[PDB]
Design a protein around this nucleic acid. Sequence first.
RNA 1: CCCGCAGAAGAAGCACCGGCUAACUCCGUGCCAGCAGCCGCGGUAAUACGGAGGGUGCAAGCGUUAAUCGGAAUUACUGGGC
RNA 2: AAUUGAAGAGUUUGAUCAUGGCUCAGAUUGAACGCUGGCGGCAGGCCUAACACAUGCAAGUCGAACGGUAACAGGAAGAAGCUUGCUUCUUUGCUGACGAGUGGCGGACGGGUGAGUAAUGUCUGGGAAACUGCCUGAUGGAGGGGGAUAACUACUGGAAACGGUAGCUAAUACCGCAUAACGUCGCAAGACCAAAGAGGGGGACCUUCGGGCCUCUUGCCAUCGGAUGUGCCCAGAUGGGAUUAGCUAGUAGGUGGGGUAACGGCUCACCUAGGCGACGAUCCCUAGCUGGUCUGAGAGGAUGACCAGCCACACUGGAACUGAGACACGGUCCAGACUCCUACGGGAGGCAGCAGUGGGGAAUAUUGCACAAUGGGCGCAAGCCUGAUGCAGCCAUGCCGCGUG
Lengths: 690, 85, 122, 62
Amino acid sequence: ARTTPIARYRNIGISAHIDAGKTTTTERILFYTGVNAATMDWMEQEQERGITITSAATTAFWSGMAKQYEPHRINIIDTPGHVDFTIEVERSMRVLDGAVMVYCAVGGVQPQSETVWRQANKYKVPRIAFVNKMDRMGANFLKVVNQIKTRLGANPVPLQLAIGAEEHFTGVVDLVKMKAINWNDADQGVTFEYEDIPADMVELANEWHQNLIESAAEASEELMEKYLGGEELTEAEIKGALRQRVLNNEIILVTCGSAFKNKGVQAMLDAVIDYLPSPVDVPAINGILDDGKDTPAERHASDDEPFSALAFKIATDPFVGNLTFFRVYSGVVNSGDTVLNSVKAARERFGRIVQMHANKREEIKEVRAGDIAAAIGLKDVTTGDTLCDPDAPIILERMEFPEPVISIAVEPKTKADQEKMGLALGRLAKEDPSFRVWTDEESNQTIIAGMGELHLDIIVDRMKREFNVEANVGKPQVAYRETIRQKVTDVEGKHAKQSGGRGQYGHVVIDMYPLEPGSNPKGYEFINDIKGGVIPGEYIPAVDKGIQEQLKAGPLAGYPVVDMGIRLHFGSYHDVDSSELAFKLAASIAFKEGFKKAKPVLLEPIMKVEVETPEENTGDVIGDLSRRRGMLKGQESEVTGVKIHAEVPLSEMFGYATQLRSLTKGRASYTMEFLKYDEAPSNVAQAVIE
Amino acid sequence: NIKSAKKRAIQSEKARKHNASRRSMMRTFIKKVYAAIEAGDKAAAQKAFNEMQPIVDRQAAKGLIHKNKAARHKANLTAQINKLA
Amino acid sequence: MIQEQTMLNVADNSGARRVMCIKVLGGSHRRYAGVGDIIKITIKEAIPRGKVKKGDVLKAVVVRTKKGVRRPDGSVIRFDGNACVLLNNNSEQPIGTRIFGPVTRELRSEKFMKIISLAPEV
Amino acid sequence: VTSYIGGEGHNLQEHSVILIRGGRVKDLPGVRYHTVRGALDCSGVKDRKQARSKYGVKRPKA
RNA sequence: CCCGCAGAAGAAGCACCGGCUAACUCCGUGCCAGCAGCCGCGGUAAUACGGAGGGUGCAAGCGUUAAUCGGAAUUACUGGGC
RNA sequence: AAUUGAAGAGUUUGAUCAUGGCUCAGAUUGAACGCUGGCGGCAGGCCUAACACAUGCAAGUCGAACGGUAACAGGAAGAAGCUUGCUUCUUUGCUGACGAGUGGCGGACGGGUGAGUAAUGUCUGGGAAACUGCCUGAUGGAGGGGGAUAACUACUGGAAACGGUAGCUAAUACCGCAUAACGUCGCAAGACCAAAGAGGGGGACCUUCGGGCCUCUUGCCAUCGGAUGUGCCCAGAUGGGAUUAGCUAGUAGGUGGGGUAACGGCUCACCUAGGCGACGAUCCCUAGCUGGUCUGAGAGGAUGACCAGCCACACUGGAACUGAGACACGGUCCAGACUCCUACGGGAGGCAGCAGUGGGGAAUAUUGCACAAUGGGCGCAAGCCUGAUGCAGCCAUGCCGCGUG
Ligand SMILES: Nc1nc2c(ncn2[C@@H]2O[C@H](COP(=O)(O)OP(=O)(O)CP(=O)(O)O)[C@@H](O)[C@H]2O)c(=O)[nH]1
Ligand SMILES: [Mg+2]
Ligand SMILES: [Mg+2]
Ligand SMILES: [Mg+2]
Ligand SMILES: [Mg+2]
Ligand SMILES: [Mg+2]
Ligand SMILES: [Mg+2]
Ligand SMILES: [Mg+2]
Ligand SMILES: [Mg+2]
Ligand SMILES: [Mg+2]
Ligand SMILES: [Mg+2]
Ligand SMILES: [Mg+2]
Ligand SMILES: [Mg+2]
Ligand SMILES: [Mg+2]
Ligand SMILES: [Mg+2]
Ligand SMILES: [Mg+2]
Ligand SMILES: [Mg+2]
Ligand SMILES: [Mg+2]
Ligand SMILES: [Mg+2]
């Protein structure tokens, strides 16, 4: 139909380390914006544990705390802290335009601040900053500001200053408008009296970081040329100045406050509209055409463009069915327009539409570009898919899928539930791509995988709650192998079945000898070094088949036999009685006894393991790799971390992620894949007895 | 139940209480007659029948007992009030 | 006064019907449970559908005791029989969803609120 | 019930969710059903070209 | 529904081809891999498996499965037997 | 002119004929799946869980029955900022109209579903002891009085649902009294039964100047008809089982009382000792019936979606009340299972109406448009209501057309 405000849109997501208030702070908004509060942790579990598990989107209208503004429409997304659910930030930053990075007045940057930082950079998303909890013991605004500079290698710009600290935290200083903002006693926020700087800070206040104003200066030289020429810059041209540079992410404005005392959150909202983008202050989207090739999909942020949106986040509400959240980058969709899932090559027909609206699932018939909402009833739209105009098809960028770091095998407690465990794990997969499930090609047990111990925990817990399948968990099994160590000299097999029927007799003499990991496909070598004709070459295929059979699960403990070679040398037959079968058994017998005398051993699988860790704790990490019965092989010192290279056994890497984290303060990727089989240490071997 | 023509419920209740009370006494009168027969008093039977006839008829008219019922009472009451009395 | 052995009736769905106290939790040698105390329980009866089945071992909340309850002033409340609300073994907290028969004020606990919210009396 | 898996190769392991067809295999007494390739968790026959409608193989990119 | 406009322009798949059954060859494979409604194909020149060329039948559908009756006079009153 | 149409093949064997099963060609489908997919017309679309349900809608309407003014509008038993016939404030229910309330009619239709029901039903053909709103024919009645009560007002309890005391008021609400046959009881003689007013207009005569009064239009009561609807009775047909053979106390009949709209063990007291069943009672299992549908040359076999008739059900068990009509799908009461609201004392609800979610499943659709038409409710009418209906959306699900030259 018509629309209304448009381009006064603020798509911002709040994200930070755990605690921090990245949620408390979000509820505070809904109070301030909702003058005249729907808890943002509304999952049952995420209330029980008191932690944000899933990204939660609402919208509300901020006229600016002073009345100062033409009403702006803000889309907020409170993201999880934690790792475990980092997926909830990839998506929650790919799609939206602005970002309010929260920091604990007490807790410095801290590890998961760095990770969300990298995710913001991954997507070059503009951002300001809000140092929460100024009222807490050990509060120190400027210290943290400095850590953003030091630890995050970024350019902070204190857009504000704190009036005192901890229990003596009474207000803040807008050091643009150069007044000491005063929030009052009751009514939480609202009200003001905009008091001037106190005698305490006038010295500090007469900074701004003059390289605020000198930071604003650096927008354009003709903007600073008058600054060099000592011309005090107009309030209006500064806000534009540093905003110009916020948008170009060369600067992070810091605001600070305390959600609890209600002293600070509001000034921060203003900073949003002041210095965080509109959906038009934005690079148009990149993308592809279908089969054909590139071209940036482009699609300007315009109502009158062809529709194009990305699907982030899938859910299922028990009353309306599937909810599919999207961000419309271009064009428009009307309830009934049949858009296209380009990345699945099927079309979908839009139906009812819902915007989560501070506290009510308000209904919509049209959704314009620059906005977000959830589409009810869409059939097969997974996370990352693009919904574009069928006449103007395009694939969009699609964020990235964090890739699990932990695996654990699960069994359905009640054998009955085994079917249902299948159904449920499937559902949780299409909701969380950072979660994965499969069935071990060998030792067929159900294996799930996630970004960590806690991730895994609440998934399994989610099964009980939503699918009523409880299942206990265990260490994944390991695929062992078998071989011999000594070449064993001419061993003898023989059949001779005078019983009553087919004559049948075969006799064979062979040498069994270990190999080295040779020729990919085989790992097995049969040699026809038979004499001139002690056994006819027609039966020679059979003797090979007979050995072949014994390799499927060797004599030590089932488990395939590998790296074995065999040489024919001698035998004997009847002119008639001997047969394919006869020598097939003879070989079978020849394999045994030969294997017994050949010093057999139990093999175990090893991984090429690659740990990526900071300089600070490459000591602990090495030692642990060693503790884990591991061999090390290199170190690079690749840029900032230090890649460590090692060969470490599988049955020994289980739950690495969990501890690797503990040893490196959360900052340490790693990766592994199969490399080889080596002898298992005895106590291992004799343990592995079925 | 959320259908405002549930006034029908409060309405037809007033009805039940009205019907009940009228329907009550026309019964207690018919009784008086049978009692007389059991007491044997030919006089009080024909007397009590005279008292009950208008009631049975009026109520039948007012649509509380209906016609043929009215008949049936004075019909076989009569049969009996002059069968030994 | 409940004590080990002792059948209790159940005042919820879940489906227990008849249940036996196999331990008075909460202290070494604790003799009796009553009032609104917690006890370990073994199901003896159990309806066919039901959350619980016969032979299960759970906890439960004494909700009515025949010896009843006193509290201040000197009065007494006695109930004709002994009844309890089954609790899940980990979380306390009723496994049921409806309460039957009256319950008493003493039960006005954080964890037992769900009981008095349900329940048609005292 | 025991069921046949036609065509050259398959994925299909202990937890695969399949769609069973009906139709015997008169070499396998007791096997009275086929598992429908290309339905649900069963993949179509890799690299097949003829009679693709059976064996759940999609047309290869005109 | 009619009248104008531009340009072949925007629009073809699916099963089958050993007998029953309309439609045949090369290659690969070698009782393997596989086919199969019924009989039955495959152990080195496979019109039966798989690919190709070709053909046959259907066509916005075509196959497979499931299902009822028919052929089944194989519950026989019509219309059967010992 | 109009139930005028009957096809065989492969396979037991070294070969043969017979026997006999397996198998195939056809037609059909509420289909599903795999690969594929341009349009249109007409139609069809939860076959499984009569599984549980968020949200909105699916039943109202009459001021021409009544007291009435909460909002609108107009007029004003008339008034400012002056913008003097063009405004926005206060009054007055005056008129139009109208929230709440009394009252009337409808809510028993329309729609959904197949759980139950193997004969309490359905089908076919008959039958006698019955009631029947609105519609209709005829005949007369429509006189004169009385007591109330919602709304309202004043106190007052709740978080909410809901109310609580006291007092006041209208009518076509309510009750006497009169009137009383071609009505009811009664052989008769005789006894006994009802009702309501309201609107539009108006010459005179007129009055408390409200209208009397006159007229037309409606409505009210009674009786007998018509029409439609419904209840009741009988015979015959309408699944399988004997690895169910016996069944039966209100049971079978009678008499007399009671009872229903009505006949009747319908009920009750007494008397008789009967009643049913191998023509299958009884007890098990399964099941809505029919018109028709599919197949078949036919006889048959299979089947009861969509359309139309009948029955049954309305969260589960049960009960009645109101009413012409129900033992009531979006009514009441009790009980149960379950869900929801609560400020913890207390409350509320039942999609097998439309759309829709979850669930189950191989599988079955939009939380659409409109009362313009046909039809239904209320209304004198205008009109209001109508998820009946008329259209559209979804799906190659089917049929028939057409294209891709
Ligand atoms: N004293 C004080 N406490 C604060 C302040 N802001 C937030 N908190 C507290 O920090 C705690 C966590 O708040 P929360 O919003 O959950 O942080 P979070 O980001 O949601 C934790 P997660 O990463 O799981 O989402 C709360 O107890 C909250 O009250 C503050 O300004 N002052
Ligand atoms: Mg914590
Ligand atoms: Mg949080
Ligand atoms: Mg901390
Ligand atoms: Mg041929
Ligand atoms: Mg060849
Ligand atoms: Mg072939
Ligand atoms: Mg036949
Ligand atoms: Mg015969
Ligand atoms: Mg009204
Ligand atoms: Mg009279
Ligand atoms: Mg009698
Ligand atoms: Mg009688
Ligand atoms: Mg049934
Ligand atoms: Mg026949
Ligand atoms: Mg019921
Ligand atoms: Mg009545
Ligand atoms: Mg209903
Ligand atoms: Mg499903």
